Amino acid sequence: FKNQLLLTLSSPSEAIYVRTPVRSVTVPGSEGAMTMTNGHSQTVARLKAGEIIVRKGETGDEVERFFLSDGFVLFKSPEDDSGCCTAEVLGVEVVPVSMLDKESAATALQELLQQGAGATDEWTKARTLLGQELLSSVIRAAP
Amino acid sequence: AGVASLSAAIALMSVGGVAQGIGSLFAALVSGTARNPSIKEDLFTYTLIGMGFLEFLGIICVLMSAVLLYS
Amino acid sequence: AGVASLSAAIALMSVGGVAQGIGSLFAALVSGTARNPSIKEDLFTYTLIGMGFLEFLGIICVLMSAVLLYS
Amino acid sequence: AGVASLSAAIALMSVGGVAQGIGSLFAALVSGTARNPSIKEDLFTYTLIGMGFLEFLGIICVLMSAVLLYS
Amino acid sequence: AGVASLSAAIALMSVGGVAQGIGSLFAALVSGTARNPSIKEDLFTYTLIGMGFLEFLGIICVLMSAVLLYS
Amino acid sequence: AGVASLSAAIALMSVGGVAQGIGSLFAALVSGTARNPSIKEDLFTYTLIGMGFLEFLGIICVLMSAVLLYS
Amino acid sequence: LTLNVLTPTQAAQSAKEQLNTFEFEPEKTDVWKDLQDFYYACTVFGCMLDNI
Amino acid sequence: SFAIPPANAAALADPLPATPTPPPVFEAVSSAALKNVEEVSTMERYEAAVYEESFKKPIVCLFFARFSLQSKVLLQPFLDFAASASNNATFFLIDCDRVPRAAYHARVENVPSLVVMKGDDAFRQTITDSVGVKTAGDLIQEARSALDQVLRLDQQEGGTKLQPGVSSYTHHIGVDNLNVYRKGWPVA
């Protein structure tokens, strides 16, 4: 077909992209953020949180932001006959940044800190810390 | 007495180690900003905090070098 | 006397410690660029800041390698 | 010219650090190319930029060696 | 025969860093080949360029050693 | 009196860095074999090329030692 | 249809040489346990959708 | 002493005459406006484009000629690129024999030629195959890269950093002396 990047960004409730040709796609890996493009090696990565940033071939300069909670990314080499290299971004909850809020975010942060102040269980402490992480990411990412 | 030159030059060797530390620190910044380019600020803060101490160390090394030079 | 040349050759030993710092910094730049090219021109700037120190910390010692050579 | 020859010999210890920085840079370039070949040329550019600095340092110390071997 | 062999052996000390850089570079080559064999030939090239610096510096070093062995 | 012996011993010091480089080489070899045995046979080739440089430099070192322990 | 599904005993009994072509950003031993739960979840999801 | 005769009736004749068209059997072979571009017919239109639209947003011009087969091969993928990226740039289709002053302006020496233009000299990148090694896909890839570059550079530094260069004072007079009339200078 073409030497583009065939992105499919999919959540269970909605598939935002299916075979979308793009140029570069930034993703917040568990180690750190990284940008996948055509020619990138085969790889699997776990995501933690943050703002995926898609950049179509027609756009070039224009972008598209999507906040992801958790999930995986699968980059697969290009078949010899297809001429195009594929990428699959699976997210358990993939929102855009336009639909986010910082006030309900801070309210949930306060309620989480209230619930976790009685730190007794490991899962409770871990959930409090991870909620702090994700809510700070949401606050920093929202407009 | 040219001999007092030698000590000062020897003191200058420490500056190499200081440079090494500085390099490592800035590498840690240039990596961190790529791992998390959203912040780019709280890392620069700690970078400057460390560079304060490293520049202080380099400056006192230079001063001791000049002291052992002239005396 | 000629002994000062030894001081100079000792003052040039901080070079080759500066080189490791430059290498580490530019290697971090290379790795962060290969991981996230989208922010390339930022990391370059940070390297220009690091060399804002290192490029001095080298030549300073080279100047000492002259001053404790001729005196 | 004994002490001059000894100074010139001692001047050439920084070459180890220069070589180590070069190896660090080329290792980072090789790793980044193994990750994303599509950012080859940019990476090569940055590599050469850093290499320029390292080369400069090398040439500098070599020159100083020559100086302390003749003057 | 003091200064001649002394300066020779001293100048022959900076090859350890050259060997270390070579080892690091070829280790990066091996890792990159392990992670992405498809561009094996594209890495080897760069490693040779690394030699084109490293070994060249080593050559200079050895030559200077001989020159101070028969200066 | 111990000029030749001392110069030979000082020359023989780079074997440490040589062995460190060889260790880094074979560490990368075993790591790449653990991460992809299917290309094991390829990796060892490059590793041998690495030795083809490292050991070669080491050999030069020992030759210079043999030259300087007898003038 | 009937899906023969992989389990931890069957994963430990295999060296997973088939995934060596893939670069796992965390190490394979650290990411496998988190990948397998996602695999389990996705399997049930599509199967039940098709059944519905 | 060097001279060239002024012209001939052949040279001044219509460069693009009509030729007979076949019936629908010759078309049957083994190998068997556009709403996104603009065919340019007039140096007035070309100048309007270059001096206003190329200052507003970048342009991509394909200079072709009928005799060339590479132009025929490159036309359709050029139209697909235009349909893809017309939102970010304008797209023009120029025949060298119909509008030569546009070809002299863009400094095209071979056909087909892509020309990415912005500010009329702030960014001018010419893509072509003088050797005969590249293909249409290669040319379109190079054009996409150049368009990305010029867009990025226009975004760089608050819209500035893309200012006109030698055309600030040359007015393409050394390239095409007929611009003295445009500038209103005498010719006596």
3-state SS of chain H is CCCCCCCCHHHHCCCCCCCCCCCCCCCCCCCCCCCCCEECCCHHHHHHHHHHHHHHCCEEEEEECCCCHHHHHHHHHHHHHHHHHCCCCEEEEEECCCCHHHHHHHCCCCCCEEEEEECCCCEEEEECCCCCCCCHHHHHHHHHHHHHHHHHHHHCCCCCCCCCCCHHHHCCCCCCCCHHHHHCCCCC
Residue with the two structure tokens 């804002």: C52
Going by C-alpha positions, the residue among G26, H42, A3 that lies closest to residue D38 is A3
Q: Give the domain extent around C21.
A: 1-71
Beta partners for residue A85, in sequence order: A5
Name A133's Cβ contacts closer than 8 Å, sequence gap at least 6: A48, A49
Q: How many residues does chain A have?
A: 143
Say if CB B19 and CB C14 are below 8 A apart.
Answer: yes
Say if CB H145 and CB H155 are below 8 A apart.
Answer: no
With beta carbons under 8 A apart, name residues in chain D contacting A37.
Answer: 36, 38-39
Task: Please count the other Cβ atoms lying within 10 Å of the Cβ belonging to residue G43.
Answer: 13
Name B54's Cβ contacts closer than 8 Å, sequence gap at least 6: B18, B21, B22, B25
Measured between alpha carbons, how far is E42 from E30 in angstroms, rounded to an integer? 13
Partners of chain G (3+ Cβ pairs below 8 A): A, F
Measured between alpha carbons, how far is D22 from C71 in angstroms, rounded to an integer? 34
Partners of chain D (3+ Cβ pairs below 8 A): A, C, E
Measured between alpha carbons, how far is H149 from H143 in angstroms, rounded to an integer? 10
Residue D59 token pair: 């040439």
CB proximity E31 to A under 8 Å: no
With beta carbons under 8 A apart, name residues in chain A contacting H148.
Answer: 60
**CA of F29 vs chain G CAs: smallest distance (Å):** 16
**CA of A33 vs chain H CAs: smallest distance (Å):** 22
- CB pair distance less than 8 Å for D9 and E14: no
With beta carbons under 8 A apart, name residues in chain C contacting A50.
Answer: none
Chains B and C touch (3+ CB pairs under 8 A): yes
Partners of chain B (3+ Cβ pairs below 8 A): A, C
Say if CB H53 and CB H59 are below 8 A apart.
Answer: yes
Beta strand H38-39 pairing with H90-95: parallel
Measured between alpha carbons, how far is H30 from A47 in angstroms, rounded to an integer? 51
CB proximity A24 to C under 8 Å: yes
Q: Residue A65 — φ and ψ, nearest 5°?
A: -105, 140
Residue with the two structure tokens 């790591």: F31
How many Cβ pairs within 8 Å bridge chains A and G? Answer: 33
Sign of CA dihedral C52, C55, C60, C61: positive
With beta carbons under 8 A apart, name residues in chain C contacting A33.
Answer: 35-36
Angle, helices F3-11 vs E2-11, to 10°: value is: 10
Assess whether the previous peptide bond of H112 is cis (omega < 30° from 0). Answer: yes
- CB pair distance less than 8 Å for D35 and A41: yes
Beta strand A43-47 pairing with G23-24: parallel
- CB pair distance less than 8 Å for D19 and E57: yes
Please state the domain count of chain B: 1
- CB pair distance less than 8 Å for A61 and H84: no
Say if CB C65 and CB B63 are below 8 A apart.
Answer: no
Task: Please count the other Cβ atoms lying within 10 Å of the Cβ belonging to residue C4.
Answer: 21
Task: Please count the other Cβ atoms lying within 10 Å of the Cβ belonging to residue F13.
Answer: 15
Q: Which run of H or E residues covers position A26?
A: strand A20-28
Resolution (A): 4.8
Task: Write the CA distances from A111 to A114, A122, A132, A138, C44, integer angstroms.
Answer: 5, 18, 11, 16, 42
Q: Give the domain extent around A105.
A: 101-143
Please state the domain count of chain A: 2
Same domain flag for A71 and A124? no
Say if CB E37 and CB F42 are below 8 A apart.
Answer: yes
By Cβ distance, the residue of A3, A58, A61 closest to H155 is A61
Type of residue numbered B7? S
Coil, helix or strand for A109? helix
Same domain flag for A78 and A135? no
Q: Which run of H or E residues covers position E56?
A: helix E40-69
Type of residue numbered A15? A
Same domain flag for A60 and A96? yes
Measured between alpha carbons, how far is G12 from G5 in angstroms, rounded to an integer? 14
